[PDB]
From a paper:
Here, we present and characterize a panel of nanobodies that can be used to functionalize designed proteins built using CC dimers such as protein origami. The nanobodies were selected to bind to different CC modules representing the edges of the designed tetrahedral protein. The crystal structures of five complexes consisting of CC dimers and nanobodies show that the nanobodies bind primarily to the noninteracting sites of the CC dimers and, in addition to complementarity determining region 3 (CDR) loops, strongly rely on the nanobody framework residues for binding. The most extensively characterized protein origami cage, tetrahedron TET12SN, self-assembles from a single 461 amino acid residue polypeptide chain consisting of 12 CC dimer-forming modules adopting antiparallel or parallel orientations (APH2, BCR2, GCN2, P3-P4, P5-P6, and P7-P8).
The P5-P6 is a representative from the designed set of orthogonal parallel heterodimeric CC peptide pairs. In the crystal structure of the Nb34-P5-P6 complex, the asymmetric unit contains one molecule of Nb34 in complex with P5-P6 and two additional free Nb34 molecules involved in the crystal contacts. The structure of the P5-P6 peptide dimer agrees with the proposed design and comprises four heptads with an NINI pattern at position a, which together with the pattern LLLL at position d form the hydrophobic seam of the P5-P6 dimer. Nb34 interacts with both chains of the P5-P6 dimer, mainly with the residues closer to the C terminus of P5-P6. The CDR2 loop contains a stretch of Ala residues which, together with W33 on CDR1, create hydrophobic contacts with the core residues at positions a and d. Additional interactions by CDR1 include a cation-pi interaction with K20e and a hydrogen bond with Q23b. The arginine R100 on the CDR3 loop is involved in a network of interactions with several residues on both P5 and P6 chains (N16a, Q11c’, and E15g’). Finally, non-CDR residues on β-strands C’ and C” and the C”D loop contribute to binding. Compared with other nanobodies, the binding affinity of Nb34, measured for the tetrahedral protein TET12SN, is rather weak, Kd = 21 µM, while the affinity for the isolated P5-P6 peptide is likely even lower and could not be reliably determined using ITC.
Author numbering: 3 to 115
C-alpha cells in the first residue's frame, strides 16, 4: 500500500513537497517512481529512484527543478517541486513501476493564479 500527500493549490513559480508513505516492509529493496496524470492526458513518468537512493532519473521537463529522494528508515518517498507552472497541474502518484502500476490514491497539484 502507498499513500501520497502534500498536494495543493499553488501559484505559478511556487513550490510543493510531495510525500508518499509505504506500508510494506519491502520498500527498502524497491525501485520507486513518481508519475502524474494531467487533465485529459495519460499517465506520464516524472522521476525514478533506486532502492539505495544512489541513482535517480527525471523527465526532461522537470530536470533541475524537481528532486526525488527517499528515507528507507521511515519508508517514505519524497518529491520536491519548484518553479511550478500551470502545465504541472495533475494528480501525482507514487508507484513501483515507471508505468504507474501499484499507485496510491494520488494527491492533486493545482497551479493557477
Amino acid at each position: 500500500q502507498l499513500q501520497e500527500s502534500g498536494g495543493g493549490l499553488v501559484q505559478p513559480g511556487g513550490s510543493l513537497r510531495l510525500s508518499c508513505a509505504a506500508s510494506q516492509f519491502t520498500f527498502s529493496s524497491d525501485w520507486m517512481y513518481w508519475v502524474r496524470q494531467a487533465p485529459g492526458k495519460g499517465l506520464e513518468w516524472v522521476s525514478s529512484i533506486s532502492p539505495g537512493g544512489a541513482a535517480t532519473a527525471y523527465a526532461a521537463s522537470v530536470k533541475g527543478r524537481f528532486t526525488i529522494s527517499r528515507d528507507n528508515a521511515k519508508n517514505t518517498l519524497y518529491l520536491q517541486m519548484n518553479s511550478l507552472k500551470s502545465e504541472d497541474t495533475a494528480v501525482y502518484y507514487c508507484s513501483k513501476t515507471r508505468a504507474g502500476t501499484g499507485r496510491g490514491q494520488g494527491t492533486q497539484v493545482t497551479v493557477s493564479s
